[PDB]
């Protein structure tokens, strides 16, 4: 309790009052002294190590608050209490090796319910350098073979909001100039056989790396007419794309209890067949005794 209020995350209420407005973004509280402050709430802001800091109001419309009581829960505050996980029923015995040394089994059910989901955010970036071989454009053009891969790009250049960029997809379009300083013989005849007139440029477009990439969420740009920024020399403009994903609980992840049972998930079991209680209730996790 003293952790969520002191660690700043959950937005408390100063002086007593009633709740006036309640957006998913603002909680203009009404103080019983004619005052009504607007309490902005970071929607889905990015953390330094990527986790999220999305806040959520916990007060109805027209409520008479108690000085010092959460109006909105911080990131992991259930309700003013430092909540960094879930209470799952744990059975503790050995399973056909699935929990072999220090590995844990997770009841598929746990995901049927949006339990262990986490919302992480990755920030992809890229620059339009001014190379002496010519200025690196940032157009919606990818020279060689398709348009089927241009959809998401939508707007000329940057990718359109709400587009699940599958790993390997174009996140932003960019063009650099091919040769170190010269064209090429074999590649001269070639391009001519099928249309010598071809953008003798290159595709150095910022793509998502092997691993993952989800649904875009926000894109920044600092092109010409720089407001109050400090781009760097060699940089014509810096385009930012923010991608976010719901990372459910898949094998490989390491869930752990505040005592040390530092383990990693090795098998998601379909509820169908995992240890069940005399009545209808099964267990969600399972733990080896050999470690205690």
């Amino acid at each position: 309790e003293r952790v969520v209020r002191d660690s700043l995350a959950a937005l408390y209420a100063e002086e007593d009052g009633e709740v006036a407005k309640v957006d998913g973004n603002r909680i203009v509280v009404r103080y019983e002294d004619g005052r009504l402050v607007e309490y902005p709430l970071r929607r889905f802001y990015r953390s330094n190590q990527g986790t999220a800091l999305d806040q959520r109001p916990r007060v109805v419309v027209g409520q008479r608050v108690r000085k010092g009581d959460l109006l909105a829960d911080g990131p992991a505050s259930e309700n003013g209490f430092l909540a960094l996980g879930q209470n799952v029923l744990v059975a503790i015995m050995p399973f056909d090796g699935y929990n072999f040394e220090d590995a844990i089994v997770i009841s598929e059910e746990l995901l049927k319910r949006d339990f262990y989901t986490s919302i992480h955010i990755e920030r992809y970036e890229i620059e339009a350098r001014d190379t002496k071989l010519g200025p690196e454009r940032i157009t919606r053009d990818i020279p060689h073979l398709s348009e089927a891969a241009l959809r998401d790009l939508d707007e000329e250049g940057v990718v359109r909001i709400g587009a699940e960029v599958k790993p390997g997809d174009i996140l932003v379009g960019r063009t650099s100039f091919k040769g170190e300083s010269e064209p090429t013989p074999e590649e001269r005849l070639l391009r001519s056989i099928f249309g010598e007139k071809a953008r003798d440029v290159k595709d150095t477009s910022l793509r998502v790396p092997p691993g993952e990439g989800g649904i875009v969420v926000r894109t920044v740009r600092l092109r010409r007419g720089d407001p109050g920024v400090e781009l760097k020399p060699g940089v014509r403009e810096v385009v930012r794309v923010y991608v976010a994903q719901k990372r459910k609980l898949q094998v490989g992840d390491k869930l752990a209890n505040r005592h040390g049972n530092k383990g990693v998930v090795a098998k998601i079991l379909p509820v169908e067949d995992m240890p069940h209680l005399p009545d209808g209730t099964p267990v969600d996790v399972i733990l080896n005794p050999l470690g205690v």
Binding site: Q49, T51, L84, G85, Q86, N87, V88, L89, V90, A91, I92, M93, Y116, S118, P210, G211, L249, G252, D253, K254, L255, A256, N257, R258, K262, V271, E272, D273, M274, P275, H276, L277, P278, P282, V283, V285
Partner: protein
């Protein structure tokens, strides 16, 4: 277990096979009725679980409960890396990405 006597049922033909292997073990006082046999076995913290695959039980009480399990954060290292071929340093000609 209170609701058991109410909802309309009693201890399985499974809910006892366990108790024997329990009394033989040495957890539940022999003689004492099944009913009071499970409590003494519940108050040790364990309960009679059945295998979700065979319907048959797990010969022997298996302590269960509610533990607070947090999900630990991933480092860039945990990410899986796979490199067939790729970039190569300038000086030191040893691969890199």
């Amino acid at each position: 277990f209170g609701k058991r006597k109410g909802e309309g049922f009693g201890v399985d033909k499974r809910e006892v096979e366990v108790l024997r292997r329990a009394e033989k073990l040495g957890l539940v006082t022999p003689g004492k009725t099944p009913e009071e046999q499970l409590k003494e076995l519940f108050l040790q913290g364990k309960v009679v679980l059945y295998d979700g695959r065979t319907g048959e039980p797990i010969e022997g009480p298996i302590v269960v409960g509610q533990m607070f399990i947090m999900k630990l954060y991933h480092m860039v290292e945990d990410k899986m890396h796979a490199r067939s071929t790729g970039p190569y340093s300038l000086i030191t000609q040893q691969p890199l990405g």
